[PDB]
Amino acid sequence: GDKLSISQVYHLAQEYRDHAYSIANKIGSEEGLKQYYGLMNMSIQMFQLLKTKCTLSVLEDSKVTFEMVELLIQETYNFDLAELYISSLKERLQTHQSDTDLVEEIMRCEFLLLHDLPLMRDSKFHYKIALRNCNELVQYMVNLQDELYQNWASVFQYVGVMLCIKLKQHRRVKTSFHGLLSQCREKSQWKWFLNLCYVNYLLNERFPIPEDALQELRSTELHTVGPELYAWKLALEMVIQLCKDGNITDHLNEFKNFFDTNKQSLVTNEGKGCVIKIMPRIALKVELPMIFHYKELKNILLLLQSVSYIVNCYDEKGNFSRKFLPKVYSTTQKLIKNIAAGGVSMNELDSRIQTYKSILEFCEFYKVWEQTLLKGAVVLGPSPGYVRLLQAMKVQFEGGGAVEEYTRLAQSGGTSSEVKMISLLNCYTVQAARVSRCSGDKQGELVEQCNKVWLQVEKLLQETDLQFNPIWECTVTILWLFSHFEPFSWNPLPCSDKQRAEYVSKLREFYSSNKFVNRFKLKKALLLQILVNYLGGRMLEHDLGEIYAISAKCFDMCRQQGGMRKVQYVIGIWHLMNCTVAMRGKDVALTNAKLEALVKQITS
Amino acid sequence: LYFQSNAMSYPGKDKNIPGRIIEALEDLPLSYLVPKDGLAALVNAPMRVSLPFDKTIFTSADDGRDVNINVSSIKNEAEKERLVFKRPSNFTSSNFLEGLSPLAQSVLSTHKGLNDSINIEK
């Protein structure tokens, strides 16, 4: 029969695989896809040839099985088959474990069984099996006083956490992270890595970040953790500022200094990933190509910076976004076009391209969003609910109310809480506006809805980090006061004297910090800045000179963005009074004229 | 309650225009609330954590082992073993045998019938 040496078959299996990796970035048609998988097929079959037609030692069997199964996991849907090979390997290793050093191999079998296979499966049923068995494994290993098994137990505690995340067991995740982190050596690369996983998970869910995790993040040392993981730290610190609408100047400068001194490290290390040596013979490789590669990282940072400036809109900060989102877009297009091997699966490159495409979708989305802010009209879907949010806002802009649109969006299960809450707040604003202008007949159906929608806002806000976002906290205060006090509404909702003082006290904090001449500081969101000063000027200011100066500023500020004419008109009524009281003839004339001009535009 | 505004007359007061601030917001989305969903996840993915296993095998030059190399459409359990490769969402680009060793090329050609590879979507 036709024969080859055992090493020749092994090297052929490797050659077929490594050659597929070498052309993995060159698949542009069905033909190329057939050839790519034709190679992988041969590689797998050659590996199978070794396992079925040869007598392999435990180490040989381990190596061959791992390389083969690696392909089953990354190239195929044959997960059950992969699992059978690893399970078989595991049982064989256990038979020789007494007289042969095989711990490394056994632990890798468990990693494939509990981490790699379940994640690729992405099945809830198998996630539960994995989590159950993983906890069983950890329990068994912590009972071994040996340092090797103690460290391995830590790795699989981390696997368990990742399984909890996929199962969306958020209370268990937090509990597991804390228990996991508490057992790690302090100021170690391993602990700081896990803490980064923790913070990122919390940000993904917009959960409040505990103080200790925050301090742990800030204490992360570059020279202990390496330039790759530190870039991730810096990125996360940027996202934190973005989520709280904080200032990013300091955080930008940190990235700047980081790049100046560690650019070369990222470029020379590009592709090789990040290796965390937990112990001798316990090394974890971490890959985050968007963050670990220099070009990809700057591209992400430029996106985050631009998103942070969207709300600014009309000023120099806004102009930055309009200028550099196109750059992010074009850069991303080139990253897709010039994607390289290797030697990684075509399917790895495929997932990276999919993420690149999402970035393109973010660029378009925020382009539309910034224009909507600027013009007061709507003319992507990178995240759930974004498309129908823009559609709902379009209806509201057209005086359609869009209650049903917002309500349905706030009720869908796939949408983030942030989108749900934007929908609920706009919905509350509409309903509160209707309570004000509608007759006493429909007042009954409108106030309950206000109270209903409001409790929903409070509930979601209380379980997100938005409660610590001053823009969001101020919006809540403003909307409550507008809906509970004359002359901001014709029919204010009922409230206790304690509630009034509560919200009036919140207003005082935001207004004293953001008055037209400290984390009460609001970004220069035009509409927000005007409403807070309007509300503060009406409720908190007594001096005529101060009231006039504020009303004048509010009045004039409205011109900076479209869609502000009805707001400006109401502000105009207020300013006219202040002119009338102050007996300022010239200012009465100009203000009346401006009101007349606004009426003509509005009633078109 | 009394306020000077609603008491005194002004342009548009008789028109259908909001005279109080909450009514002015009925057709104005609070668009300064810029959603940030997906951005944190963008930092977090794509991400891979793996266990590198670097151990050389088949190094003994004296090794004498060699290998004999000459070797449905209904829902079945046998399809567990039959390989199904992953249809990718994208093409990674807008003759792949080139570079293969002669032996690799020869074995590939001899077993061309076994290359009726099935590619499927999730």
Author numbering:
A (entry chain A): 5 to 383, 390 to 527, 536 to 622
B (entry chain B): -6 to 64, 73 to 95, 105 to 132
Excerpt from the publication:
In addition to initiating a connection between cohesin and chromatin, Scc2/4 determines the timing and location of cohesin loading. We report here the structure of yeast Scc4 in complex with an N-terminal fragment of Scc2 and demonstrate that Scc4 determines cohesin localization through a conserved patch on its surface.
We used an incomplete model, built into a 2.8 Å resolution map, to obtain phase information by molecular replacement for diffraction data from crystals of a native protein complex, extending to a minimum Bragg spacing of 2.1 Å. Repeat 8, which has a particularly long first helix, lacks a second helix and has instead an extended segment with a disordered surface loop. This irregularity divides the solenoid into two subdomains, TPRN (Scc41–384) and TPRC (Scc4391–624). Residues 10–50 of Scc2 snake along the continuous inner cavity of Scc4 and emerge at both ends, with the N-terminus of Scc2 close to the C-terminus of Scc4. First, the concave surface of Scc4 is entirely enclosed, and Scc2 dissociation would therefore require either unfolding or proteolysis of Scc2 or Scc4. Second, residues 58–132 of Scc2 extend beyond the axial groove and make extensive contact with the external surface of Scc4. Several Scc2–Scc4 contacts on the external face of Scc4 are also conserved, including Scc2F86, which stacks onto Scc4Y40-Y41, and Scc2112–120, which forms a helix that fits over a hydrophobic surface on Scc4 TPRN. Mapping Scc4 sequence conservation onto our structure revealed a cluster of extremely conserved, solvent-facing residues, some of them invariant among all eukaryotes we examined.
